[PDB]
Coordinates of C-alpha atoms and ligand atoms in Angstrom, one line a residue:
Chain A
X2 CA 92.7 -93.4 -198.2
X3 CA 90.4 -92.2 -195.8
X4 CA 90.8 -88.6 -193.7
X5 CA 90.1 -88.6 -189.8
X6 CA 89.6 -85.6 -187.8
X7 CA 89.6 -85.9 -184.0
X8 CA 88.3 -83.2 -181.8
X9 CA 89.8 -83.8 -178.3
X10 CA 89.1 -81.9 -175.3
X11 CA 91.0 -82.8 -172.5
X12 CA 93.5 -80.3 -170.6
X13 CA 96.0 -82.8 -169.5
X14 CA 98.7 -84.6 -172.3
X15 CA 99.1 -87.2 -169.8
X16 CA 95.5 -88.3 -169.0
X17 CA 93.6 -91.3 -169.8
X18 CA 92.1 -89.3 -172.4
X19 CA 95.0 -88.0 -173.7
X20 CA 96.2 -92.0 -174.1
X21 CA 93.3 -92.7 -176.1
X22 CA 93.7 -89.9 -178.2
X23 CA 97.3 -90.6 -178.9
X24 CA 96.8 -94.4 -179.7
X25 CA 94.2 -93.0 -182.4
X26 CA 96.7 -91.0 -183.9
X27 CA 99.1 -93.7 -183.8
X28 CA 97.2 -96.5 -185.2
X29 CA 95.2 -94.7 -187.7
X30 CA 98.5 -93.1 -189.0
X31 CA 100.2 -96.6 -189.2
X32 CA 97.3 -97.5 -191.4
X33 CA 98.0 -94.9 -193.8
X34 CA 95.3 -92.5 -192.8
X35 CA 95.4 -89.0 -193.2
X36 CA 95.0 -87.6 -189.3
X37 CA 94.1 -84.0 -188.1
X38 CA 93.5 -83.3 -184.4
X39 CA 91.5 -80.0 -183.0
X40 CA 93.1 -79.9 -179.3
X41 CA 90.5 -77.8 -178.2
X42 CA 92.2 -76.8 -175.1
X43 CA 95.4 -76.1 -176.6
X44 CA 93.6 -74.0 -179.2
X45 CA 91.9 -72.1 -176.3
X46 CA 89.2 -72.7 -178.7
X47 CA 86.3 -70.0 -178.1
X48 CA 83.0 -71.5 -176.8
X49 CA 80.8 -68.9 -177.0
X50 CA 78.1 -68.2 -179.4
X51 CA 78.5 -64.3 -180.1
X52 CA 78.4 -61.4 -182.7
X53 CA 82.2 -61.6 -182.9
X54 CA 81.7 -65.3 -184.9
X55 CA 80.7 -62.7 -187.6
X56 CA 82.9 -60.4 -189.3
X57 CA 82.1 -57.1 -191.4
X58 CA 78.4 -56.3 -190.9
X59 CA 75.5 -57.9 -189.5
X60 CA 72.2 -58.9 -191.5
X61 CA 70.3 -57.4 -188.7
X62 CA 72.3 -55.3 -186.4
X63 CA 69.0 -54.0 -184.2
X64 CA 68.2 -57.6 -183.2
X65 CA 70.8 -60.2 -182.5
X66 CA 69.7 -63.9 -183.9
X67 CA 72.8 -66.1 -183.7
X68 CA 71.1 -68.9 -186.0
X69 CA 70.1 -66.5 -188.8
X70 CA 73.4 -64.5 -188.5
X71 CA 75.6 -67.2 -188.8
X72 CA 73.6 -69.0 -191.5
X73 CA 74.0 -65.2 -193.6
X74 CA 77.9 -65.5 -192.7
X75 CA 78.0 -68.8 -194.2
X76 CA 76.5 -68.4 -197.2
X77 CA 78.5 -64.8 -197.8
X78 CA 82.0 -66.2 -196.5
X79 CA 81.8 -64.1 -193.2
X80 CA 82.1 -66.5 -190.4
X81 CA 85.5 -66.3 -187.8
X82 CA 88.3 -68.0 -189.1
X83 CA 88.6 -70.1 -185.8
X84 CA 85.1 -71.6 -187.4
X85 CA 85.8 -71.9 -190.8
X86 CA 89.3 -73.4 -190.2
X87 CA 87.3 -76.2 -188.1
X88 CA 84.6 -76.5 -190.8
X89 CA 87.3 -77.2 -193.6
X90 CA 88.7 -80.0 -191.4
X91 CA 85.1 -81.4 -191.0
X92 CA 84.2 -80.9 -194.9
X93 CA 87.7 -83.1 -195.6
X94 CA 87.0 -85.9 -193.2
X95 CA 85.4 -89.3 -193.8
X96 CA 85.2 -90.1 -189.7
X97 CA 84.8 -87.5 -187.0
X98 CA 86.1 -89.0 -183.8
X99 CA 85.2 -86.9 -180.4
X100 CA 87.4 -88.0 -177.7
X101 CA 86.4 -86.3 -174.0
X102 CA 85.5 -87.3 -170.2
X103 CA 81.8 -86.9 -169.6
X104 CA 81.1 -83.7 -168.0
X105 CA 77.3 -83.4 -166.4
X106 CA 76.1 -86.4 -169.0
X107 CA 77.4 -84.4 -171.8
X108 CA 80.6 -83.0 -173.6
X109 CA 82.4 -80.5 -171.7
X110 CA 81.6 -76.7 -172.4
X111 CA 84.8 -76.0 -175.0
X112 CA 83.5 -79.0 -177.3
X113 CA 79.9 -77.8 -176.4
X114 CA 81.0 -74.7 -178.2
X115 CA 82.5 -76.4 -181.0
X116 CA 79.0 -78.4 -181.6
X117 CA 77.2 -74.9 -181.4
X118 CA 79.8 -72.5 -183.5
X119 CA 81.2 -74.7 -186.1
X120 CA 77.9 -76.8 -186.9
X121 CA 76.0 -73.8 -188.7
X122 CA 73.2 -73.8 -190.6
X123 CA 74.3 -73.9 -194.3
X124 CA 77.3 -76.4 -193.3
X125 CA 75.9 -78.9 -191.5
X126 CA 72.4 -78.9 -192.2
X127 CA 69.5 -76.6 -193.8
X128 CA 66.0 -76.6 -195.0
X129 CA 65.9 -79.2 -196.0
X130 CA 68.7 -81.6 -195.3
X131 CA 68.7 -82.8 -192.0
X132 CA 68.9 -86.4 -190.1
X133 CA 68.9 -88.8 -193.0
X134 CA 69.6 -86.3 -195.4
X135 CA 71.7 -83.8 -193.1
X136 CA 74.8 -81.8 -195.0
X137 CA 77.5 -84.2 -193.5
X138 CA 75.7 -87.3 -194.9
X139 CA 78.5 -89.9 -196.1
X140 CA 80.8 -89.0 -193.0
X141 CA 80.8 -91.0 -190.1
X142 CA 81.4 -89.3 -186.4
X143 CA 82.1 -91.7 -183.5
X144 CA 82.1 -90.6 -179.9
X145 CA 85.0 -91.7 -177.3
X146 CA 83.7 -91.0 -174.1
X147 CA 85.4 -91.8 -170.4
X148 CA 83.2 -91.7 -167.3
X149 CA 83.2 -91.2 -163.9
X150 CA 80.7 -93.8 -163.1
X151 CA 81.2 -97.5 -163.7
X152 CA 79.2 -99.7 -166.0
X153 CA 76.5 -100.6 -163.7
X154 CA 75.6 -97.3 -162.5
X155 CA 75.0 -96.5 -166.4
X156 CA 72.1 -99.4 -166.4
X157 CA 68.1 -98.7 -167.0
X158 CA 67.7 -99.2 -163.4
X159 CA 71.1 -98.3 -161.9
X160 CA 71.7 -94.5 -160.4
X161 CA 73.0 -93.3 -163.7
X162 CA 69.9 -94.6 -166.1
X163 CA 71.6 -96.4 -169.3
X164 CA 74.5 -95.0 -171.1
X165 CA 72.3 -94.5 -174.4
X166 CA 70.2 -92.3 -172.5
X167 CA 73.2 -89.2 -172.0
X168 CA 74.1 -90.4 -175.8
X169 CA 70.5 -89.4 -177.2
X170 CA 71.4 -85.4 -177.3
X171 CA 74.8 -86.1 -178.7
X172 CA 74.3 -89.0 -181.3
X173 CA 70.7 -88.4 -181.8
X174 CA 70.2 -84.5 -181.7
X175 CA 73.7 -83.1 -182.9
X176 CA 75.4 -85.8 -185.0
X177 CA 72.3 -87.6 -186.9
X178 CA 71.0 -84.3 -187.2
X179 CA 73.8 -83.0 -189.2
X180 CA 73.7 -86.2 -191.5
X181 CA 76.3 -88.4 -189.7
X182 CA 76.3 -92.2 -189.6
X183 CA 77.0 -92.7 -186.2
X184 CA 79.3 -95.5 -185.2
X185 CA 79.0 -97.3 -182.0
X186 CA 80.2 -95.1 -179.2
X187 CA 83.4 -96.3 -177.5
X188 CA 82.7 -95.9 -174.0
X189 CA 85.7 -96.2 -171.6
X190 CA 84.0 -96.7 -168.1
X191 CA 85.6 -95.3 -165.1
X192 CA 89.4 -95.4 -166.1
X193 CA 90.3 -93.6 -162.7
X194 CA 89.4 -96.5 -160.3
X195 CA 90.3 -99.5 -162.8
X196 CA 93.9 -101.2 -162.2
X197 CA 97.1 -100.2 -164.1
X198 CA 96.0 -103.5 -166.3
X199 CA 92.0 -103.3 -166.9
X200 CA 93.0 -99.5 -168.0
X201 CA 95.8 -101.2 -170.7
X202 CA 92.9 -103.0 -171.9
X203 CA 90.6 -100.5 -172.3
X204 CA 93.2 -98.4 -174.5
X205 CA 94.4 -101.4 -176.1
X206 CA 90.4 -102.5 -177.0
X207 CA 90.3 -98.9 -178.3
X208 CA 93.2 -99.2 -180.6
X209 CA 92.4 -102.8 -181.6
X210 CA 88.9 -101.6 -182.4
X211 CA 90.4 -98.7 -184.6
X212 CA 92.2 -101.5 -187.0
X213 CA 88.7 -102.5 -188.0
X214 CA 87.0 -99.3 -188.0
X215 CA 86.3 -99.2 -191.7
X216 CA 84.2 -102.5 -191.9
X217 CA 82.0 -101.3 -189.4
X218 CA 78.3 -100.5 -189.7
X219 CA 76.8 -97.4 -188.2
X220 CA 73.8 -97.8 -185.4
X221 CA 70.4 -97.4 -186.2
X222 CA 70.4 -93.8 -184.6
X223 CA 66.6 -94.0 -183.5
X224 CA 64.6 -93.4 -180.3
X225 CA 64.3 -97.4 -180.2
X226 CA 68.0 -97.8 -180.3
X227 CA 68.5 -95.3 -177.5
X228 CA 65.6 -96.1 -174.8
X229 CA 64.0 -99.2 -176.0
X230 CA 64.8 -102.6 -175.0
Chain B
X1 CA 57.0 -64.5 -149.8
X2 CA 60.4 -64.5 -148.3
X3 CA 62.4 -66.4 -150.9
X4 CA 65.2 -65.8 -153.0
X5 CA 65.9 -66.5 -156.8
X6 CA 68.9 -66.7 -159.1
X7 CA 68.0 -67.1 -162.9
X8 CA 70.8 -68.2 -164.6
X9 CA 70.2 -66.6 -168.1
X10 CA 72.0 -67.5 -171.4
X11 CA 71.1 -65.2 -174.2
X12 CA 73.1 -62.6 -176.4
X13 CA 70.0 -60.6 -177.4
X14 CA 68.1 -58.5 -174.9
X15 CA 65.3 -58.1 -177.2
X16 CA 65.0 -62.0 -177.7
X17 CA 62.0 -64.2 -176.8
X18 CA 64.6 -65.5 -174.1
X19 CA 64.9 -61.9 -173.0
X20 CA 61.3 -61.3 -172.4
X21 CA 61.0 -64.7 -170.4
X22 CA 63.8 -63.7 -168.4
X23 CA 62.1 -60.2 -167.6
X24 CA 58.8 -61.4 -167.4
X25 CA 60.3 -63.8 -164.5
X26 CA 62.1 -60.3 -162.8
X27 CA 58.9 -58.4 -162.9
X28 CA 56.5 -61.1 -161.3
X29 CA 59.1 -62.5 -158.4
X30 CA 59.7 -59.0 -157.9
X31 CA 56.2 -58.3 -157.7
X32 CA 55.4 -61.0 -155.3
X33 CA 58.7 -59.4 -153.0
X34 CA 60.9 -62.3 -153.8
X35 CA 64.7 -61.4 -153.8
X36 CA 66.1 -62.1 -157.3
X37 CA 69.4 -62.1 -158.9
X38 CA 69.7 -62.6 -162.6
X39 CA 73.7 -63.7 -163.7
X40 CA 73.2 -62.6 -167.4
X41 CA 76.1 -65.3 -168.7
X42 CA 76.9 -63.5 -172.0
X43 CA 76.9 -59.9 -170.7
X44 CA 79.3 -61.0 -168.2
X45 CA 81.6 -62.5 -170.7
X46 CA 81.0 -65.7 -168.5
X47 CA 84.2 -68.0 -169.0
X48 CA 83.2 -71.7 -169.9
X49 CA 86.1 -73.5 -170.4
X50 CA 87.5 -75.4 -167.2
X51 CA 91.3 -75.2 -167.0
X52 CA 93.9 -74.6 -164.6
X53 CA 93.1 -70.7 -164.4
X54 CA 90.2 -71.9 -162.3
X55 CA 92.7 -72.7 -159.4
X56 CA 95.1 -69.9 -158.2
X57 CA 96.6 -71.9 -155.1
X58 CA 99.4 -74.5 -155.1
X59 CA 98.1 -77.5 -157.2
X60 CA 97.7 -80.7 -155.3
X61 CA 99.5 -82.2 -158.7
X62 CA 101.5 -80.3 -161.0
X63 CA 102.8 -83.2 -162.7
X64 CA 99.1 -84.3 -163.9
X65 CA 96.3 -81.9 -164.2
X66 CA 93.0 -83.6 -163.0
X67 CA 90.4 -80.6 -163.3
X68 CA 87.9 -82.7 -160.7
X69 CA 90.4 -83.1 -158.1
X70 CA 92.2 -79.7 -158.7
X71 CA 88.9 -78.0 -158.1
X72 CA 87.3 -80.0 -155.3
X73 CA 90.8 -79.0 -153.3
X74 CA 90.7 -75.0 -154.0
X75 CA 87.0 -75.0 -153.0
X76 CA 88.3 -76.4 -149.8
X77 CA 91.2 -74.3 -149.7
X78 CA 89.5 -71.4 -151.0
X79 CA 91.6 -70.9 -154.0
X80 CA 89.1 -71.1 -156.9
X81 CA 88.7 -68.3 -159.1
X82 CA 86.4 -65.6 -158.0
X83 CA 84.1 -65.7 -160.8
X84 CA 83.4 -69.1 -159.7
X85 CA 83.1 -68.2 -156.2
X86 CA 80.7 -65.2 -156.9
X87 CA 78.1 -67.4 -158.8
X88 CA 78.6 -70.5 -156.0
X89 CA 77.4 -67.3 -153.2
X90 CA 74.5 -66.7 -155.6
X91 CA 73.3 -70.3 -155.6
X92 CA 73.9 -71.1 -151.9
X93 CA 71.7 -68.2 -151.0
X94 CA 68.9 -68.8 -153.4
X95 CA 65.7 -71.2 -152.7
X96 CA 64.9 -71.4 -156.7
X97 CA 67.3 -71.3 -159.6
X98 CA 65.8 -70.9 -162.9
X99 CA 67.9 -71.4 -166.0
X100 CA 66.3 -69.2 -169.0
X101 CA 67.8 -70.8 -172.1
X102 CA 67.3 -71.4 -175.8
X103 CA 67.8 -75.3 -176.9
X104 CA 71.5 -75.8 -178.8
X105 CA 71.9 -79.3 -179.9
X106 CA 69.3 -80.8 -177.3
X107 CA 71.6 -78.9 -174.8
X108 CA 72.1 -75.8 -173.1
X109 CA 74.5 -73.1 -174.7
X110 CA 77.8 -73.7 -174.4
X111 CA 78.4 -70.7 -172.2
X112 CA 75.6 -72.3 -169.8
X113 CA 77.0 -75.5 -169.7
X114 CA 80.5 -73.8 -168.7
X115 CA 78.6 -72.2 -165.8
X116 CA 77.8 -75.9 -164.9
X117 CA 80.7 -77.4 -165.8
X118 CA 82.5 -74.8 -163.2
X119 CA 80.3 -73.6 -160.6
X120 CA 78.7 -77.0 -159.4
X121 CA 82.1 -78.4 -158.1
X122 CA 83.0 -81.2 -155.9
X123 CA 82.4 -79.8 -152.2
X124 CA 80.1 -77.3 -153.1
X125 CA 77.3 -78.9 -155.4
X126 CA 77.8 -82.6 -154.1
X127 CA 80.5 -85.1 -152.6
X128 CA 81.3 -88.4 -152.9
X129 CA 79.1 -89.8 -151.3
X130 CA 76.5 -86.9 -151.0
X131 CA 75.0 -86.9 -154.7
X132 CA 71.3 -86.9 -155.9
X133 CA 69.0 -87.3 -153.3
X134 CA 72.2 -86.2 -150.7
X135 CA 73.3 -83.8 -153.0
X136 CA 74.9 -80.7 -150.9
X137 CA 71.8 -78.3 -152.8
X138 CA 69.2 -80.4 -151.1
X139 CA 66.6 -78.3 -150.0
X140 CA 66.7 -76.1 -153.2
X141 CA 64.5 -76.1 -156.3
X142 CA 65.4 -75.7 -160.0
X143 CA 63.4 -75.2 -163.3
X144 CA 64.8 -75.1 -166.5
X145 CA 62.9 -72.8 -168.8
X146 CA 63.9 -73.6 -172.4
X147 CA 62.6 -72.2 -175.6
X148 CA 63.2 -74.4 -178.8
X149 CA 63.3 -74.1 -182.6
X150 CA 60.7 -77.3 -182.7
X151 CA 57.3 -77.3 -182.2
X152 CA 55.5 -79.6 -179.3
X153 CA 54.4 -81.8 -181.9
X154 CA 58.0 -82.4 -183.4
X155 CA 58.9 -83.3 -179.6
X156 CA 56.7 -86.1 -178.9
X157 CA 57.4 -90.1 -179.0
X158 CA 56.4 -90.5 -182.9
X159 CA 57.7 -86.9 -183.8
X160 CA 61.2 -86.4 -185.6
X161 CA 62.8 -85.3 -182.5
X162 CA 61.5 -87.8 -180.1
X163 CA 59.5 -86.7 -177.0
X164 CA 60.7 -83.2 -175.3
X165 CA 61.6 -85.1 -172.0
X166 CA 64.2 -87.0 -173.7
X167 CA 66.6 -84.2 -173.9
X168 CA 65.6 -83.2 -170.4
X169 CA 67.5 -86.1 -168.8
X170 CA 71.4 -85.1 -168.7
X171 CA 70.4 -81.8 -167.3
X172 CA 67.6 -82.5 -164.9
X173 CA 68.8 -85.8 -163.7
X174 CA 72.4 -86.2 -164.6
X175 CA 72.9 -82.4 -163.5
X176 CA 70.3 -81.0 -160.9
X177 CA 69.2 -84.3 -159.3
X178 CA 72.7 -85.3 -159.1
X179 CA 73.6 -81.9 -157.3
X180 CA 70.4 -82.4 -154.5
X181 CA 67.9 -80.2 -156.2
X182 CA 64.3 -80.8 -156.3
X183 CA 63.2 -80.3 -159.8
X184 CA 60.2 -78.6 -160.9
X185 CA 58.3 -79.2 -164.1
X186 CA 60.1 -77.8 -167.1
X187 CA 58.8 -74.7 -168.7
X188 CA 59.1 -75.2 -172.3
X189 CA 58.4 -72.4 -174.8
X190 CA 57.9 -74.3 -177.9
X191 CA 59.0 -72.6 -181.2
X192 CA 58.3 -69.0 -180.9
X193 CA 60.0 -67.9 -183.9
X194 CA 57.1 -69.9 -185.6
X195 CA 54.2 -68.9 -183.5
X196 CA 52.1 -65.7 -184.2
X197 CA 53.1 -62.5 -182.3
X198 CA 49.7 -62.9 -180.4
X199 CA 50.7 -67.0 -179.4
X200 CA 54.1 -65.5 -178.1
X201 CA 52.7 -62.9 -175.7
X202 CA 50.6 -66.0 -174.9
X203 CA 53.5 -68.1 -174.1
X204 CA 55.1 -64.8 -172.2
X205 CA 51.8 -64.7 -169.9
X206 CA 51.5 -68.2 -169.5
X207 CA 55.1 -68.3 -167.6
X208 CA 54.1 -65.0 -165.9
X209 CA 50.8 -66.9 -164.7
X210 CA 53.0 -69.8 -163.9
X211 CA 55.3 -67.7 -161.7
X212 CA 52.3 -66.5 -159.5
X213 CA 51.7 -70.1 -158.0
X214 CA 55.3 -71.3 -158.2
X215 CA 55.8 -71.7 -154.4
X216 CA 52.8 -74.3 -154.2
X217 CA 54.3 -76.6 -156.8
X218 CA 55.4 -80.1 -156.1
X219 CA 58.7 -80.9 -157.8
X220 CA 58.5 -84.0 -160.6
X221 CA 59.7 -87.2 -159.6
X222 CA 62.9 -86.9 -161.4
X223 CA 63.4 -90.5 -162.6
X224 CA 64.4 -92.9 -165.5
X225 CA 60.5 -93.8 -166.0
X226 CA 59.6 -90.1 -165.6
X227 CA 61.9 -89.2 -168.8
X228 CA 61.4 -92.3 -170.9
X229 CA 58.1 -93.7 -169.4
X230 CA 57.7 -97.7 -169.4
Ligands
FAD1 C1 83.1 -80.8 -164.5 C2 83.0 -82.7 -164.5 C3 81.8 -83.0 -164.6 C4 81.5 -84.5 -164.8 N1 80.3 -85.0 -164.7 C5 80.4 -86.6 -165.0 C6 79.6 -87.1 -165.3 O1 78.1 -86.6 -165.5 N2 79.3 -88.2 -165.5 C7 80.5 -89.0 -164.9 O2 80.2 -90.9 -165.0 N3 81.5 -88.6 -164.4 C8 81.9 -87.2 -164.6 N4 83.0 -86.8 -164.3 C9 84.2 -87.9 -164.1 C10 85.1 -87.6 -165.3 O3 83.9 -87.9 -166.8 C11 86.0 -88.4 -165.2 O4 87.0 -87.8 -164.5 C12 86.7 -88.5 -166.7 O5 86.1 -89.6 -167.6 C13 88.2 -89.3 -166.1 O6 88.7 -89.4 -167.4 P1 90.5 -88.8 -167.6 O7 91.1 -88.9 -168.4 O8 90.2 -87.5 -167.1 O9 91.1 -89.5 -166.4 P2 92.7 -89.7 -165.9 O10 92.7 -89.5 -164.5 O11 93.9 -89.0 -166.5 O12 92.7 -91.3 -166.3 C14 92.9 -92.4 -164.9 C15 94.4 -92.5 -164.9 O13 95.0 -93.2 -165.9 C16 96.3 -92.8 -166.1 N5 96.8 -93.0 -167.8 C17 97.0 -91.9 -168.4 N6 97.4 -93.1 -170.0 C18 97.1 -94.1 -169.7 C19 97.3 -95.4 -170.4 N7 98.4 -95.3 -171.3 N8 97.1 -96.5 -169.7 C20 96.7 -96.4 -168.6 N9 96.4 -95.9 -167.7 C21 96.6 -94.2 -168.1 C22 96.3 -91.5 -165.6 O14 97.2 -90.2 -165.9 C23 95.3 -91.9 -164.6 O15 96.0 -92.0 -163.7 C24 83.0 -85.3 -164.3 C25 84.1 -84.6 -164.4 C26 84.1 -83.1 -163.9 C27 85.5 -82.6 -163.9
FAD2 C1 73.6 -73.5 -182.1 C2 72.1 -73.6 -182.1 C3 71.4 -74.7 -181.9 C4 70.1 -74.9 -181.7 N1 69.8 -76.3 -181.5 C5 68.2 -76.6 -181.3 C6 67.8 -77.8 -181.1 O1 68.9 -78.8 -180.9 N2 66.2 -77.9 -181.4 C7 65.7 -77.2 -181.5 O2 64.2 -76.9 -181.6 N3 66.2 -75.7 -181.8 C8 67.4 -75.6 -181.6 N4 67.9 -74.2 -181.8 C9 67.0 -73.2 -182.3 C10 66.9 -72.3 -180.7 O3 66.7 -73.3 -179.9 C11 65.5 -71.3 -180.9 O4 66.2 -70.7 -182.5 C12 65.3 -70.5 -179.8 O5 65.1 -71.1 -179.1 C13 64.4 -69.4 -180.0 O6 64.2 -68.5 -179.0 P1 64.7 -67.0 -179.3 O7 64.8 -66.1 -177.9 O8 66.3 -66.7 -179.7 O9 63.9 -66.3 -180.3 P2 63.4 -65.1 -180.8 O10 64.0 -65.0 -182.2 O11 64.4 -63.8 -180.0 O12 61.9 -64.7 -180.6 C14 61.3 -64.9 -182.0 C15 60.3 -63.7 -182.0 O13 59.5 -63.3 -180.7 C16 59.8 -62.1 -180.1 N5 59.4 -61.6 -178.9 C17 60.4 -61.3 -178.1 N6 59.7 -60.7 -176.8 C18 58.3 -61.0 -177.1 C19 57.5 -60.2 -176.1 N7 57.6 -60.0 -175.0 N8 56.4 -60.8 -176.6 C20 55.9 -61.4 -177.8 N9 57.4 -61.7 -178.6 C21 58.5 -61.4 -178.3 C22 61.0 -61.9 -181.0 O14 61.1 -60.1 -181.5 C23 61.0 -62.7 -182.4 O15 60.5 -61.9 -183.7 C24 69.1 -73.9 -182.3 C25 69.8 -72.5 -182.3 C26 70.8 -72.5 -182.3 C27 71.3 -71.1 -182.8
RZW3 C1 60.4 -76.4 -186.7 O1 60.8 -75.7 -187.9 C2 62.2 -76.0 -188.5 C3 62.6 -77.1 -188.4 C4 64.2 -77.3 -188.8 O2 64.5 -78.7 -188.6 C5 64.1 -79.8 -188.1 C6 65.1 -76.1 -189.4 C7 64.3 -74.8 -189.4 C8 65.0 -73.7 -189.7 C9 64.3 -72.0 -189.9 C10 66.4 -74.0 -190.4 C11 67.0 -74.9 -190.8 O3 67.8 -75.5 -191.0 N1 65.8 -76.5 -190.1 C12 66.7 -77.7 -190.2 C13 63.0 -74.8 -188.7 O4 62.0 -73.3 -188.7 C14 61.3 -73.2 -189.9
RZW4 C1 80.3 -83.6 -161.6 O1 81.1 -84.7 -161.4 C2 80.4 -86.2 -161.6 C3 79.4 -86.2 -161.8 C4 78.6 -87.5 -162.3 O2 77.3 -87.7 -162.7 C5 76.8 -86.4 -163.4 C6 79.3 -88.6 -162.0 C7 80.7 -88.5 -161.5 C8 81.6 -90.1 -160.9 C9 82.9 -89.8 -160.1 C10 80.5 -91.0 -160.9 C11 79.4 -91.1 -161.4 O3 78.8 -91.9 -161.4 N1 78.4 -89.9 -161.7 C12 77.4 -89.9 -162.5 C13 81.4 -87.3 -161.4 O4 82.7 -87.1 -160.7 C14 82.9 -86.7 -159.2
RZW5 C1 71.4 -76.4 -184.9 O1 69.6 -75.7 -185.1 C2 69.2 -76.4 -184.7 C3 68.8 -78.0 -184.4 C4 67.8 -78.4 -184.0 O2 68.0 -80.0 -183.7 C5 69.2 -80.4 -183.4 C6 66.5 -78.1 -184.6 C7 66.3 -76.7 -185.0 C8 64.9 -76.1 -185.3 C9 65.0 -74.9 -185.4 C10 63.9 -77.2 -184.8 C11 64.3 -78.2 -184.4 O3 63.2 -79.0 -184.5 N1 65.5 -79.2 -184.3 C12 65.1 -80.3 -183.8 C13 67.6 -75.7 -185.2 O4 67.6 -74.7 -185.6 C14 67.6 -74.5 -187.0
ZN6 ZN1 69.3 -90.6 -184.6
ZN7 ZN1 66.4 -87.6 -161.3

């Protein structure tokens, strides 16, 4: 059996993102997988990295250093419960899918705040244990991104550059760094200008791809993959 | 000179190395006689989430909420939440916007990502058409002043992290150039926590020193080739 966590960042259940999340739940549930969804906006998930993320008393209450404080908090079981709740889902998961609209070539700030606050030192990475040896190694991660821009805008010589170029900080700098093997991203280009069909083809392709997600090999998550020819 | 600067600052700790870079900027720019404003996001408890609370008028489509459509509308009607319009005023007046922050996950801290997502709305920062070189903030300068955990050597093409310019792309091109800014070369202060106390003073005064001649700089060519090479 396998466990999947979907971390989902869209305000509107009727959205194209909402339908992609909902077919993932339906298809992975149909296969017998254990599925959990973190619907960040419904949870009013806190995005800011602050001293509230530590309960009881700080390791150095003269000069606040978020990284050191959350590292010590993790080790002393002193993190806020919204964070540890997410860490439990991630620890149990075999695959983590992030489902979100591209905001400013990146994730919406609420999902950025999940990455900043959930993936702390001791949990997701340490000295050592990063990139290849990151603490989440053995787990799979997958970005399912929707865009306002069309596929042609996202080419090396198009106005937006190649899609892979905006993937680097998320796939390499975040998911690889924590040890994830990164599945190929699912990019649903410009759903809002596509037809009622086309949109169906995109959703159905996603549902279709999920049918054989466990047979996939991860991308080689390298500078060459993102930037080379 | 007769110029206005906005510093958008994202760090929790006033005694931090970011706190020092922000204050040296304020001291040097104020010394030159520039007009200076700082948006200290954590101290303001700045709201990062893009939600329907950012619009206070009748929604264009209250059956199916589309944040970009509703905020674009709300900007035209003046029904945006006032935290957002308070920032727009600072940006509209500024000739240079400096972002001061620690690198978090190859990007800005979520509180600052939220400032970008909610403040740079359609109608204000760009339109369709009216983006990249035609973006609505054309004529303004922006500059990322980023600190890292990683050393410079780490952030080279054959270092573990890849070249520093790679992680600049979403921010410089995808956000600031998109809105029309000309982008000045980034100030990257590498690995201050590892550096010696004297190498730290050196990085602070190197930023101070650069600001002395900031108005004479040309912007970078904010292209794929600048960021990625051939
Ligand atoms: C702050 C901000 C920053 C942005 N930055 C970027 C950026 O850097 N680059 C970029 O390219 N874009 C950017 N965008 C645009 C954004 O990425 C797109 O708006 C978003 O990806 C569209 O996805 P959605 O789910 O919201 O679309 P929706 O509008 O919800 O989807 C399109 C249509 O499909 C309908 N639908 C729902 N379910 C289904 C289904 N079952 N089958 C068929 N249709 C269905 C919807 O109701 C809708 O009519 C930005 C947007 C914002 C607000
Ligand atoms: C969630 C998260 C994600 C991160 N992701 C990344 C990443 O992707 N890539 C990466 O490289 N790093 C990353 N980091 C590390 C982060 O970028 C660095 O910790 C940050 O850049 C260091 O800057 P700071 O101001 O907090 O340093 P500080 O810890 O405040 O400063 C270091 C030292 O400089 C001293 N100092 C303060 N003022 C002065 C002064 N006037 N003169 C001389 N010294 C002074 C301080 O007192 C301190 O001792 C991440 C950190 C976190 C918390
Ligand atoms: C650039 O130096 C580095 C590089 C790292 O990873 C590449 C680090 C750390 C620290 C302190 C903790 C940690 O978990 N990692 C993962 C570091 O600081 C010494
Ligand atoms: C801020 O909103 C943005 C930002 C963008 O880029 C950073 C966008 C778009 C759309 C619709 C198409 C597109 O290609 N890009 C590149 C967008 O929607 C208006
Ligand atoms: C999540 O925290 C992170 C994440 C990183 O990369 C994504 C880091 C580092 C540090 C300290 C050095 C570094 O080179 N990288 C590359 C870090 O600090 C522990
Ligand atoms: Zn990688
Ligand atoms: Zn550019």
